[model samples]
Target chain A: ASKFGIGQQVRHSLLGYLGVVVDIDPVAAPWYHVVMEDDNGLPVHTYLAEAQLSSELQDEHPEQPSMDELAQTIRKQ
Target chain B: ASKFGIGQQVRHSLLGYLGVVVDIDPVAAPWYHVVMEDDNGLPVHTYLAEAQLSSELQDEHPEQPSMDELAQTIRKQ
Candidate 1:
């Protein structure tokens, strides 16, 4: 099994990138090296601590529409 | 002793609910499962990691408040 299996997308706050979760190290406690893709389809890995992740697979779209919308439309299901 | 005892209110960013802290698990290293109340006074539970917490006992009122009234009132501690 891969660290980040194919087809798992996640919201990457840093660099405002959103892409697939391509790898993971389960044995590593409190940290997940989340590999994601940029809008241009480049790959990058972010070493994110557990605390940094609020939710898995958060909505891919920017929570703030136009960076001016007061609230995001999609509430968690 | 309760993790979140009586009269301890918290603002749950999830679902935007403000409620009293009913219980908590101190042994947990970085995560705190909090119980909150909705505006209408309903109960709900949310697991929050320490990183997600912005502050302890945030001001109840929104950060933005209109300045109004005949004059300003001052008090000394």
Candidate 2:
């Protein structure tokens, strides 16, 4: 079964490409459509199998606001 | 001046969205075009001012292969 769903964040275990699950293909073994940014900030859309992906680490700073929060802040200005 | 270039990986300091620098607008204050993935692998493209981004953390494992390496390995199979 697919281990991830759309909108969930994931990272490529072997390639270190972090991305979100955009689409899921239900083949004999499932595949996920992911969109990652290159080191230079360009979009890189690729498909990955379950073995390639891992859950994102939770070690990021907790004080960072989410995109929604940023948008709201901008709107208030 | 723009602090980043195309193909450079950057992270949104406030939003925690990590992405690549896809394009840049050389305004009095530069802006970056970034493409990030949500938690589920979906693309989230946005324009960010220079103040919004930061250099990516380098604490990730060093053994991870790059996307180029992964492509080469797949081609050999």
Candidate 3:
């Protein structure tokens, strides 16, 4: 079963990319469609499996920035 | 510089999703735009940082299947 729902926030377990779920494919192997913001503050679409995604936000990482903050900073760079 | 190029095959470090790179973001934090196939044989777009992606194919994993194989199998289900 898919653990995530549409509009839910998720973080990639390894890469630490954060995004909101936009869609879901409920099949033998489930997948979540995620839209992430790159360092440049551009939207990047991604399809991820349940195993690779986490519901918890990793705001603790020093290098990790919120999508809003990243967008603002990237615009000035 | 981006390590992976367009049309290059890659695997997610943790989720093990397989896809081909379609675009690149060459900025302070580089990200690879990838198009992956799910178990249902549907296309999943992903934007991944270099840290979350692997150039080496993980054929060793029992559950891991080639994109071609998964696509074909999913269509039959």
Candidate 4:
């Protein structure tokens, strides 16, 4: 349904944050909300095609919030 | 005395609002309040944090106000 589905892992090319792609709008410029390793609470991040690159999940993980929690925070956008 | 002095034009890298840096508290990690172009008058388009910069301003230009008036406005900030 989306270019990146739920639970997909990624690394932000802009700020260098390793995260999971929990939600997407939209990019094509499809936009993605990335719940990063350092999850700052308010849905964490949003990025585009080149900005959010594909990556394998690493084990040096930081605890991340649930998808529902991250999605609801988008209202804070 | 910020890096982007008053009257410097820059387009928001994220949202595409072409504006003048009437005020900067910084954007680099620094930020600025860019008063943008929108023919229909404008608000202090604050928050050009992660936005990019361009020396040559793009079209849809906003009416530039006088330096004296802008100086007075910054006094209100």
Q: Which candidate is the best by lDDT?
A: 3
Best by DockQ: 3
Chain A only, candidate 4, TM-score:
0.48
Q: After superposition, how far is residue B73 of candidate 3 from its true place, in Å?
A: 7.0
Name the weakest run of 10 consecutive residues (lDDT summed) in model 1 chain B: B66-75
Q: What TM-score does model 3 score on chain A?
A: 0.67
Model 3 C-alpha lDDT per residue in residues B1-77, reported as the tens digit of each score: 67876766678888876776767888656898778754443345767888988884543434444454434333443
By summed lDDT, the worst window of 10 consecutive residues in model 2 chain A runs over: A65-74
Off by over 4 Å in 3: A57-77, B1-77
**Stretches of model 4 off by over 4 angstroms after superposition:** A1-3, A27-29, A37-43, A59-77, B1-77
Report the Cα interface RMSD of each model, rounded to 1 decimal: 15.0, 9.0, 7.4, 14.3
True contacts kept of each: 0.00, 0.00, 0.44, 0.00
- Across B1-77, the per-residue lDDT of candidate 2 in tens digits comes to 57886766677776575566667766335657666554544545666668778986552423332422322343344
Compare candidates 1 and 3 on DockQ and give the better one: 3
Error of 3 at B37 (Å): 11
CA displacement after TM-score superposition, residue B5 of candidate 3 (Å) = 21
Off by over 4 Å in 1: A1-77, B1-7, B13-15, B26-29, B39-41, B54-77
Clashing pairs in 4: A26-A30, A26-A31, A27-A30, A27-A31, B26-B30, B26-B31, B27-B30, B27-B31
lDDT of 2 by residue, A1-77 (tens): 67886766667889775565667899657988766545544334677888898976543424332322322333333
Q: What DockQ results for candidate 4? A: 0.05
